[PDB]
């Protein structure tokens, strides 16, 4: 027996598909930074793409652990171009803020259904989203310090190029 | 800047997107095997999914190496249900045979324009595709021997569960 | 004592339920031993030990908040089941009952704003997810098995390897 | 099938359930010493409780080795309070003596049936009971010398806290 | 800043409370040193360093959520107690007050559906259980010691061994 | 017995309370640098705060080593804001020069009282304060050479981030 309500399963399945989209979006930002020729920003976006995949697989495993099933949905085409580096990263910040709210919505729905297991499972994402937001604000802050000066952009490129 | 024709850039970009669908398709086969409860087949499909991402990224890299740019397209919703194990693996073989012909088409197009670099690049894929088909055919030959017998299916599950 | 008497009693009741759970799994070891499945015996003995550690975590938490543990009688558990599948079906049902009892303590602790006990119980919520699932995974393998002895022996070996 | 008499199987099964009661009793003495705030005594009682489980399991294995089956019985509520350290260890001693006599009774019953296999099996427990009784007499005799001096009780709590 | 001004202010105040907590344990060390108990001194100095890490945890969380930290004046703490037992009950009473301050932030965050701050505070809810319990254990040992100097020396070495 | 005069004990206790404020002050500059987004300057200042605590603790011990007693006084509120990176470090230099003079005042009080022990104990801080002053001056000079050019600011931000 599936021991999550169907409406919590679809909320989880929906979030799983949003995590797949988030990974595709960062790959698309990588395509942008690669066209712009910043190998370090490219490197950073590829790691973010694979990191979001692990988020999706976390949802994957919990759905099956609670007796549900996963259904993959179509993945909409992401933007392929931005108005500069600050533009791409602010789009990332806004995006992760949307992801956090979508996860917040699942938590409140689970809490209202007295689904304590799903409430507890999502705490990892609550904490993780704090870090996903902060790291992008850090880059945005450093980018505003550079203020388009290429000597500093190279430093920030090579800094983000070291992400493991 | 770009030293591939737009006809070859577009064939490569389209194949890149098909490799992304390939990974999504194999992930969806994992959701099916998880629903049916075959951990080894799940494992095998998850590893196939990650192999297809590397196929995509080899196209990604080659496009930029020749001065092109990659544009990510929508990913269609993959099927989530099959009649049984053998049908899923037959769907995989059909898929890989289809990707082989699509690569054959890029190779013939590149050869037509005397883009010898892209012809040579696709040789790796010609050789990889022979093994992608053969591995699925070996499984199908075993499933046809298994003939739906659960004790023998369980052996093949554990066997494909050992994939590295 | 810094837990309410009503929460202290709930924890103490759950400690005794956790000891009963360990005894129950020992009784399933007695059953599989009578039936001659060494691997299922192994799994059940390892499961009985795991419930003891659960009980002791309630033990320690009660004393950490100024409480005292009172051990109650342990009811006689069933000693027989109608085959391997039936015993694991009883296990799944039992663990679900354990999950609901933990949920109930968590809800009582929440409405008393006993945040320490709420947070303490999170560990058991997450653990209960696994205990339910690992029995569900066994049941699904048994359903496919359909009593076929070659597959049951394969499953005895798999469960005999639990550490 | 079973090569112990039903009368000896019942005697062994009964004693297995006494061993489980013994471990529960000692756990209960741990609950008492934990309320009293003597860490070392708690540790000792927890170690004694685990030791009685190895006793129960030893009977378990012999019963199955002789073609018998184990049936677990209800476990009585143990006392949860004593009138002091000496009183608790005195109850432990009295309990171990009762266990010894219960074990002796099985030995005499099996020897009257010429069930030599069960006679020989029980030798291990005859010897163990000598140690179990002696270890409690040792503690009681040290407590007599302590004579309520908290400085010496602390020393003794530390010593029994070192039990491996 | 993505925490509300009431939640940032509660967090900033708790940061300053943690710093006073570290200062308080430091003068408790000044007390035990005047009284000539090196082990209790050692224990109190270690408690001081631990409270700095509590403060620094609130520090980091405030910045991770886009807020800023403002350091406030630190009150002069008591410098004397009328004995070992009195010093530790001041410690216990204080940690209980810290727990309630943390509970208030938790409920404030919860009413604001600020799940991130709620979850961040779980670590402290769990930590405070152990901070209270370790002082209770010490007090319970001091009651057994009952002013006997030979036993006080024993407890002095024990707490002197804290890592 | 106390073998320092009350005025030298009182001077030493004031310096102890002054050393704690210095640590609190440097902690507050970290709050400033963290708000400005300079993680390396934050690192430097947090480690400077820990060094001031060790200064406090050396006064702590010496007071007890000559039979006195420490009384902790209120810590008066530090500033939390500066008009830029170098202005903060200008405050740092200004502060430690004040500490050096406060230490000099104790040394003279000790010299006139023929308290040779306190005179000698303080020569550690005399020598340490020379380092403390030079350490900030050198930072100040590089900030002036950098001249607000962030590529150079970023570089010694990372430089001071390497402090042990
Ligand atoms: C460095 C390359 C990153 C590319 C990310 C592409 C994301 C969008 C397409 C998703 C395809 C399916 C995901 C496969 C997951 C494989 C299973 C992982 C199990 C832990
Ligand atoms: C391997 C077989 C396990 C059988 C368990 C039967 C449980 C019945 C209750 C008996 C009392 C158990 C007391 C256990 C004390 C353990 C303390 C460990 C340290 C925290
Ligand atoms: C070294 C052993 C004694 C420690 C006593 C600590 C007393 C603290 C009093 C308040 C001081 C506040 C400023 C401390 C900043 C420390 C920052 C640490 C980050 C690494
Ligand atoms: Fe994510
Ligand atoms: Fe492929
Ligand atoms: Fe025994
Ligand atoms: Fe604290
Ligand atoms: Fe200093």
mmCIF file of N, CA and C in Angstrom, chain D residues 42-143:
data_model
loop_
_atom_site.group_PDB
_atom_site.id
_atom_site.type_symbol
_atom_site.label_atom_id
_atom_site.label_comp_id
_atom_site.label_asym_id
_atom_site.label_seq_id
_atom_site.Cartn_x
_atom_site.Cartn_y
_atom_site.Cartn_z
ATOM 1 N N UNK D 42 24.576 1.457 36.975
ATOM 2 C CA UNK D 42 23.738 1.354 35.775
ATOM 3 C C UNK D 42 24.448 0.538 34.700
ATOM 4 N N UNK D 43 25.685 0.934 34.380
ATOM 5 C CA UNK D 43 26.516 0.234 33.407
ATOM 6 C C UNK D 43 26.603 -1.256 33.717
ATOM 7 N N UNK D 44 26.923 -1.585 34.967
ATOM 8 C CA UNK D 44 27.047 -2.980 35.383
ATOM 9 C C UNK D 44 25.744 -3.735 35.157
ATOM 10 N N UNK D 45 24.619 -3.108 35.490
ATOM 11 C CA UNK D 45 23.343 -3.796 35.354
ATOM 12 C C UNK D 45 22.983 -4.002 33.886
ATOM 13 N N UNK D 46 23.311 -3.022 33.037
ATOM 14 C CA UNK D 46 23.104 -3.156 31.602
ATOM 15 C C UNK D 46 23.980 -4.257 31.029
ATOM 16 N N UNK D 47 25.201 -4.394 31.538
ATOM 17 C CA UNK D 47 26.058 -5.469 31.077
ATOM 18 C C UNK D 47 25.535 -6.809 31.569
ATOM 19 N N UNK D 48 25.028 -6.852 32.808
ATOM 20 C CA UNK D 48 24.448 -8.090 33.304
ATOM 21 C C UNK D 48 23.211 -8.473 32.493
ATOM 22 N N UNK D 49 22.367 -7.481 32.151
ATOM 23 C CA UNK D 49 21.183 -7.758 31.347
ATOM 24 C C UNK D 49 21.555 -8.395 30.014
ATOM 25 N N UNK D 50 22.532 -7.817 29.306
ATOM 26 C CA UNK D 50 22.979 -8.404 28.049
ATOM 27 C C UNK D 50 23.509 -9.814 28.259
ATOM 28 N N UNK D 51 24.182 -10.057 29.380
ATOM 29 C CA UNK D 51 24.742 -11.377 29.624
ATOM 30 C C UNK D 51 23.644 -12.412 29.795
ATOM 31 N N UNK D 52 22.544 -12.038 30.451
ATOM 32 C CA UNK D 52 21.479 -13.009 30.627
ATOM 33 C C UNK D 52 20.842 -13.378 29.285
ATOM 34 N N UNK D 53 20.783 -12.427 28.346
ATOM 35 C CA UNK D 53 20.331 -12.740 26.994
ATOM 36 C C UNK D 53 21.209 -13.815 26.348
ATOM 37 N N UNK D 54 22.531 -13.785 26.575
ATOM 38 C CA UNK D 54 23.336 -14.858 25.983
ATOM 39 C C UNK D 54 22.971 -16.199 26.610
ATOM 40 N N UNK D 55 22.668 -16.199 27.902
ATOM 41 C CA UNK D 55 22.117 -17.385 28.537
ATOM 42 C C UNK D 55 20.837 -17.859 27.854
ATOM 43 N N UNK D 56 19.854 -16.962 27.677
ATOM 44 C CA UNK D 56 18.614 -17.376 27.039
ATOM 45 C C UNK D 56 18.900 -17.996 25.682
ATOM 46 N N UNK D 57 19.746 -17.334 24.875
ATOM 47 C CA UNK D 57 20.024 -17.802 23.527
ATOM 48 C C UNK D 57 20.761 -19.124 23.533
ATOM 49 N N UNK D 58 21.554 -19.405 24.581
ATOM 50 C CA UNK D 58 22.227 -20.701 24.649
ATOM 51 C C UNK D 58 21.215 -21.822 24.815
ATOM 52 N N UNK D 59 20.204 -21.629 25.674
ATOM 53 C CA UNK D 59 19.134 -22.624 25.781
ATOM 54 C C UNK D 59 18.395 -22.760 24.451
ATOM 55 N N UNK D 60 18.076 -21.619 23.839
ATOM 56 C CA UNK D 60 17.461 -21.576 22.530
ATOM 57 C C UNK D 60 18.154 -22.531 21.568
ATOM 58 N N UNK D 61 19.473 -22.384 21.424
ATOM 59 C CA UNK D 61 20.190 -23.177 20.428
ATOM 60 C C UNK D 61 20.166 -24.661 20.775
ATOM 61 N N UNK D 62 20.316 -24.999 22.049
ATOM 62 C CA UNK D 62 20.320 -26.415 22.383
ATOM 63 C C UNK D 62 18.958 -27.034 22.104
ATOM 64 N N UNK D 63 17.884 -26.312 22.420
ATOM 65 C CA UNK D 63 16.535 -26.824 22.178
ATOM 66 C C UNK D 63 16.353 -27.196 20.708
ATOM 67 N N UNK D 64 16.787 -26.314 19.790
ATOM 68 C CA UNK D 64 16.664 -26.610 18.371
ATOM 69 C C UNK D 64 17.648 -27.687 17.954
ATOM 70 N N UNK D 65 18.835 -27.713 18.578
ATOM 71 C CA UNK D 65 19.804 -28.755 18.271
ATOM 72 C C UNK D 65 19.276 -30.132 18.636
ATOM 73 N N UNK D 66 18.323 -30.217 19.568
ATOM 74 C CA UNK D 66 17.749 -31.501 19.953
ATOM 75 C C UNK D 66 16.385 -31.755 19.347
ATOM 76 N N UNK D 67 16.031 -31.038 18.278
ATOM 77 C CA UNK D 67 14.784 -31.244 17.560
ATOM 78 C C UNK D 67 13.576 -30.600 18.197
ATOM 79 N N UNK D 68 13.752 -29.868 19.288
ATOM 80 C CA UNK D 68 12.651 -29.195 19.928
ATOM 81 C C UNK D 68 12.409 -27.828 19.334
ATOM 82 N N UNK D 69 11.352 -27.189 19.836
ATOM 83 C CA UNK D 69 10.937 -25.859 19.417
ATOM 84 C C UNK D 69 10.794 -24.979 20.652
ATOM 85 N N UNK D 70 11.094 -23.683 20.506
ATOM 86 C CA UNK D 70 10.979 -22.731 21.615
ATOM 87 C C UNK D 70 9.645 -22.003 21.517
ATOM 88 N N UNK D 71 8.938 -21.893 22.632
ATOM 89 C CA UNK D 71 7.778 -21.023 22.723
ATOM 90 C C UNK D 71 8.047 -19.990 23.808
ATOM 91 N N UNK D 72 8.084 -18.717 23.409
ATOM 92 C CA UNK D 72 8.272 -17.593 24.319
ATOM 93 C C UNK D 72 6.984 -17.301 25.085
ATOM 94 N N UNK D 73 7.097 -17.139 26.412
ATOM 95 C CA UNK D 73 5.981 -16.853 27.316
ATOM 96 C C UNK D 73 5.967 -15.383 27.750
ATOM 97 N N UNK D 74 4.836 -14.950 28.319
ATOM 98 C CA UNK D 74 4.768 -13.598 28.870
ATOM 99 C C UNK D 74 5.883 -13.395 29.887
ATOM 100 N N UNK D 75 6.361 -12.161 30.002
ATOM 101 C CA UNK D 75 7.413 -11.815 30.954
ATOM 102 C C UNK D 75 6.805 -10.996 32.074
ATOM 103 N N UNK D 76 6.984 -11.463 33.301
ATOM 104 C CA UNK D 76 6.410 -10.800 34.460
ATOM 105 C C UNK D 76 6.970 -9.399 34.620
ATOM 106 N N UNK D 77 6.143 -8.510 35.171
ATOM 107 C CA UNK D 77 6.641 -7.206 35.561
ATOM 108 C C UNK D 77 7.662 -7.373 36.659
ATOM 109 N N UNK D 78 8.875 -6.829 36.551
ATOM 110 C CA UNK D 78 9.865 -6.913 37.616
ATOM 111 C C UNK D 78 9.668 -5.813 38.628
ATOM 112 N N UNK D 79 10.215 -5.925 39.849
ATOM 113 C CA UNK D 79 10.246 -4.764 40.740
ATOM 114 C C UNK D 79 11.030 -3.653 40.058
ATOM 115 N N UNK D 80 10.651 -2.413 40.343
ATOM 116 C CA UNK D 80 11.346 -1.250 39.811
ATOM 117 C C UNK D 80 12.066 -0.463 40.903
ATOM 118 N N UNK D 81 11.917 -0.847 42.176
ATOM 119 C CA UNK D 81 12.520 -0.084 43.259
ATOM 120 C C UNK D 81 13.059 -0.994 44.357
ATOM 121 N N UNK D 82 14.149 -0.545 44.969
ATOM 122 C CA UNK D 82 14.795 -1.239 46.069
ATOM 123 C C UNK D 82 15.069 -0.216 47.162
ATOM 124 N N UNK D 83 15.355 -0.699 48.368
ATOM 125 C CA UNK D 83 15.554 0.198 49.494
ATOM 126 C C UNK D 83 17.001 0.629 49.645
ATOM 127 N N UNK D 84 17.804 0.478 48.611
ATOM 128 C CA UNK D 84 19.192 0.919 48.656
ATOM 129 C C UNK D 84 20.065 -0.007 47.883
ATOM 130 N N UNK D 85 21.328 0.424 47.694
ATOM 131 C CA UNK D 85 22.284 -0.331 46.899
ATOM 132 C C UNK D 85 22.375 -1.771 47.397
ATOM 133 N N UNK D 86 22.695 -1.939 48.683
ATOM 134 C CA UNK D 86 22.808 -3.284 49.237
ATOM 135 C C UNK D 86 21.549 -4.099 48.979
ATOM 136 N N UNK D 87 20.388 -3.460 49.080
ATOM 137 C CA UNK D 87 19.149 -4.196 48.888
ATOM 138 C C UNK D 87 19.032 -4.714 47.454
ATOM 139 N N UNK D 88 19.417 -3.878 46.480
ATOM 140 C CA UNK D 88 19.378 -4.257 45.079
ATOM 141 C C UNK D 88 20.320 -5.427 44.799
ATOM 142 N N UNK D 89 21.563 -5.327 45.257
ATOM 143 C CA UNK D 89 22.505 -6.408 44.998
ATOM 144 C C UNK D 89 22.128 -7.656 45.779
ATOM 145 N N UNK D 90 21.531 -7.491 46.951
ATOM 146 C CA UNK D 90 21.020 -8.655 47.658
ATOM 147 C C UNK D 90 19.907 -9.332 46.878
ATOM 148 N N UNK D 91 19.017 -8.548 46.241
ATOM 149 C CA UNK D 91 17.982 -9.170 45.421
ATOM 150 C C UNK D 91 18.592 -9.914 44.240
ATOM 151 N N UNK D 92 19.659 -9.358 43.650
ATOM 152 C CA UNK D 92 20.349 -10.010 42.545
ATOM 153 C C UNK D 92 20.926 -11.357 42.965
ATOM 154 N N UNK D 93 21.625 -11.385 44.103
ATOM 155 C CA UNK D 93 22.164 -12.626 44.645
ATOM 156 C C UNK D 93 21.064 -13.656 44.858
ATOM 157 N N UNK D 94 19.996 -13.258 45.555
ATOM 158 C CA UNK D 94 18.880 -14.163 45.788
ATOM 159 C C UNK D 94 18.345 -14.686 44.467
ATOM 160 N N UNK D 95 18.267 -13.810 43.470
ATOM 161 C CA UNK D 95 17.755 -14.231 42.178
ATOM 162 C C UNK D 95 18.685 -15.262 41.542
ATOM 163 N N UNK D 96 19.998 -15.012 41.575
ATOM 164 C CA UNK D 96 20.911 -15.950 40.922
ATOM 165 C C UNK D 96 20.895 -17.313 41.602
ATOM 166 N N UNK D 97 20.734 -17.336 42.913
ATOM 167 C CA UNK D 97 20.596 -18.602 43.623
ATOM 168 C C UNK D 97 19.340 -19.358 43.203
ATOM 169 N N UNK D 98 18.234 -18.642 43.025
ATOM 170 C CA UNK D 98 17.029 -19.274 42.529
ATOM 171 C C UNK D 98 17.259 -19.853 41.143
ATOM 172 N N UNK D 99 17.994 -19.122 40.287
ATOM 173 C CA UNK D 99 18.278 -19.579 38.937
ATOM 174 C C UNK D 99 19.126 -20.839 38.976
ATOM 175 N N UNK D 100 20.122 -20.862 39.870
ATOM 176 C CA UNK D 100 20.954 -22.035 40.034
ATOM 177 C C UNK D 100 20.115 -23.234 40.419
ATOM 178 N N UNK D 101 19.203 -23.049 41.376
ATOM 179 C CA UNK D 101 18.389 -24.182 41.794
ATOM 180 C C UNK D 101 17.470 -24.628 40.662
ATOM 181 N N UNK D 102 16.971 -23.670 39.868
ATOM 182 C CA UNK D 102 16.132 -24.041 38.742
ATOM 183 C C UNK D 102 16.937 -24.844 37.728
ATOM 184 N N UNK D 103 18.211 -24.466 37.534
ATOM 185 C CA UNK D 103 19.088 -25.193 36.622
ATOM 186 C C UNK D 103 19.411 -26.571 37.180
ATOM 187 N N UNK D 104 19.763 -26.650 38.465
ATOM 188 C CA UNK D 104 19.945 -27.951 39.117
ATOM 189 C C UNK D 104 18.737 -28.868 38.911
ATOM 190 N N UNK D 105 17.525 -28.328 39.023
ATOM 191 C CA UNK D 105 16.354 -29.184 38.882
ATOM 192 C C UNK D 105 16.291 -29.811 37.488
ATOM 193 N N UNK D 106 16.679 -29.060 36.459
ATOM 194 C CA UNK D 106 16.680 -29.624 35.124
ATOM 195 C C UNK D 106 17.703 -30.715 35.035
ATOM 196 N N UNK D 107 18.851 -30.488 35.675
ATOM 197 C CA UNK D 107 19.922 -31.463 35.612
ATOM 198 C C UNK D 107 19.458 -32.764 36.223
ATOM 199 N N UNK D 108 18.767 -32.681 37.357
ATOM 200 C CA UNK D 108 18.312 -33.902 38.018
ATOM 201 C C UNK D 108 17.233 -34.606 37.211
ATOM 202 N N UNK D 109 16.318 -33.836 36.606
ATOM 203 C CA UNK D 109 15.285 -34.401 35.750
ATOM 204 C C UNK D 109 15.881 -35.117 34.542
ATOM 205 N N UNK D 110 16.818 -34.462 33.835
ATOM 206 C CA UNK D 110 17.442 -35.080 32.670
ATOM 207 C C UNK D 110 18.259 -36.307 33.070
ATOM 208 N N UNK D 111 18.963 -36.216 34.190
ATOM 209 C CA UNK D 111 19.756 -37.351 34.623
ATOM 210 C C UNK D 111 18.854 -38.517 35.026
ATOM 211 N N UNK D 112 17.647 -38.230 35.532
ATOM 212 C CA UNK D 112 16.722 -39.317 35.856
ATOM 213 C C UNK D 112 16.160 -39.976 34.597
ATOM 214 N N UNK D 113 16.108 -39.251 33.487
ATOM 215 C CA UNK D 113 15.676 -39.829 32.222
ATOM 216 C C UNK D 113 16.837 -40.410 31.440
ATOM 217 N N UNK D 114 18.035 -40.430 32.022
ATOM 218 C CA UNK D 114 19.249 -40.813 31.299
ATOM 219 C C UNK D 114 19.423 -39.997 30.012
ATOM 220 N N UNK D 115 18.985 -38.738 30.024
ATOM 221 C CA UNK D 115 19.219 -37.826 28.901
ATOM 222 C C UNK D 115 20.577 -37.164 29.117
ATOM 223 N N UNK D 116 21.635 -37.920 28.764
ATOM 224 C CA UNK D 116 23.010 -37.515 29.053
ATOM 225 C C UNK D 116 23.416 -36.295 28.257
ATOM 226 N N UNK D 117 22.869 -36.157 27.050
ATOM 227 C CA UNK D 117 23.158 -34.973 26.258
ATOM 228 C C UNK D 117 22.730 -33.705 27.000
ATOM 229 N N UNK D 118 21.552 -33.719 27.637
ATOM 230 C CA UNK D 118 21.123 -32.517 28.364
ATOM 231 C C UNK D 118 21.909 -32.342 29.651
ATOM 232 N N UNK D 119 22.253 -33.445 30.320
ATOM 233 C CA UNK D 119 23.124 -33.351 31.489
ATOM 234 C C UNK D 119 24.428 -32.657 31.119
ATOM 235 N N UNK D 120 25.039 -33.065 30.010
ATOM 236 C CA UNK D 120 26.348 -32.498 29.686
ATOM 237 C C UNK D 120 26.231 -31.039 29.286
ATOM 238 N N UNK D 121 25.216 -30.713 28.479
ATOM 239 C CA UNK D 121 24.938 -29.329 28.111
ATOM 240 C C UNK D 121 24.825 -28.431 29.327
ATOM 241 N N UNK D 122 24.230 -28.925 30.399
ATOM 242 C CA UNK D 122 23.958 -28.041 31.523
ATOM 243 C C UNK D 122 25.201 -27.772 32.355
ATOM 244 N N UNK D 123 26.279 -28.564 32.178
ATOM 245 C CA UNK D 123 27.510 -28.325 32.930
ATOM 246 C C UNK D 123 28.007 -26.904 32.741
ATOM 247 N N UNK D 124 27.888 -26.382 31.521
ATOM 248 C CA UNK D 124 28.344 -25.017 31.300
ATOM 249 C C UNK D 124 27.618 -24.043 32.229
ATOM 250 N N UNK D 125 26.321 -24.273 32.465
ATOM 251 C CA UNK D 125 25.540 -23.376 33.323
ATOM 252 C C UNK D 125 25.817 -23.601 34.805
ATOM 253 N N UNK D 126 26.020 -24.853 35.206
ATOM 254 C CA UNK D 126 26.458 -25.113 36.570
ATOM 255 C C UNK D 126 27.700 -24.285 36.862
ATOM 256 N N UNK D 127 28.678 -24.331 35.959
ATOM 257 C CA UNK D 127 29.892 -23.554 36.197
ATOM 258 C C UNK D 127 29.628 -22.054 36.152
ATOM 259 N N UNK D 128 28.816 -21.590 35.207
ATOM 260 C CA UNK D 128 28.544 -20.160 35.111
ATOM 261 C C UNK D 128 27.872 -19.624 36.374
ATOM 262 N N UNK D 129 26.929 -20.382 36.942
ATOM 263 C CA UNK D 129 26.238 -19.922 38.138
ATOM 264 C C UNK D 129 27.194 -19.713 39.309
ATOM 265 N N UNK D 130 28.243 -20.534 39.421
ATOM 266 C CA UNK D 130 29.257 -20.288 40.446
ATOM 267 C C UNK D 130 29.818 -18.876 40.297
ATOM 268 N N UNK D 131 30.216 -18.504 39.073
ATOM 269 C CA UNK D 131 30.711 -17.146 38.856
ATOM 270 C C UNK D 131 29.618 -16.101 39.118
ATOM 271 N N UNK D 132 28.387 -16.306 38.600
ATOM 272 C CA UNK D 132 27.360 -15.274 38.759
ATOM 273 C C UNK D 132 27.073 -15.002 40.229
ATOM 274 N N UNK D 133 27.038 -16.052 41.039
ATOM 275 C CA UNK D 133 26.813 -15.877 42.460
ATOM 276 C C UNK D 133 28.000 -15.176 43.105
ATOM 277 N N UNK D 134 29.207 -15.632 42.780
ATOM 278 C CA UNK D 134 30.406 -15.074 43.388
ATOM 279 C C UNK D 134 30.572 -13.604 43.058
ATOM 280 N N UNK D 135 30.242 -13.205 41.832
ATOM 281 C CA UNK D 135 30.482 -11.809 41.489
ATOM 282 C C UNK D 135 29.579 -10.892 42.304
ATOM 283 N N UNK D 136 28.376 -11.349 42.660
ATOM 284 C CA UNK D 136 27.497 -10.514 43.471
ATOM 285 C C UNK D 136 27.926 -10.537 44.933
ATOM 286 N N UNK D 137 28.371 -11.689 45.433
ATOM 287 C CA UNK D 137 28.898 -11.719 46.792
ATOM 288 C C UNK D 137 30.072 -10.763 46.922
ATOM 289 N N UNK D 138 30.968 -10.765 45.930
ATOM 290 C CA UNK D 138 32.070 -9.810 45.938
ATOM 291 C C UNK D 138 31.568 -8.374 46.099
ATOM 292 N N UNK D 139 30.553 -7.985 45.328
ATOM 293 C CA UNK D 139 30.055 -6.613 45.412
ATOM 294 C C UNK D 139 29.434 -6.345 46.781
ATOM 295 N N UNK D 140 28.614 -7.282 47.280
ATOM 296 C CA UNK D 140 27.973 -7.128 48.583
ATOM 297 C C UNK D 140 29.010 -6.992 49.691
ATOM 298 N N UNK D 141 30.073 -7.785 49.609
ATOM 299 C CA UNK D 141 31.109 -7.713 50.616
ATOM 300 C C UNK D 141 31.875 -6.398 50.521
ATOM 301 N N UNK D 142 32.088 -5.861 49.300
ATOM 302 C CA UNK D 142 32.707 -4.537 49.223
ATOM 303 C C UNK D 142 31.761 -3.466 49.783
ATOM 304 N N UNK D 143 30.461 -3.582 49.485
ATOM 305 C CA UNK D 143 29.501 -2.630 50.025
ATOM 306 C C UNK D 143 29.436 -2.698 51.552
#
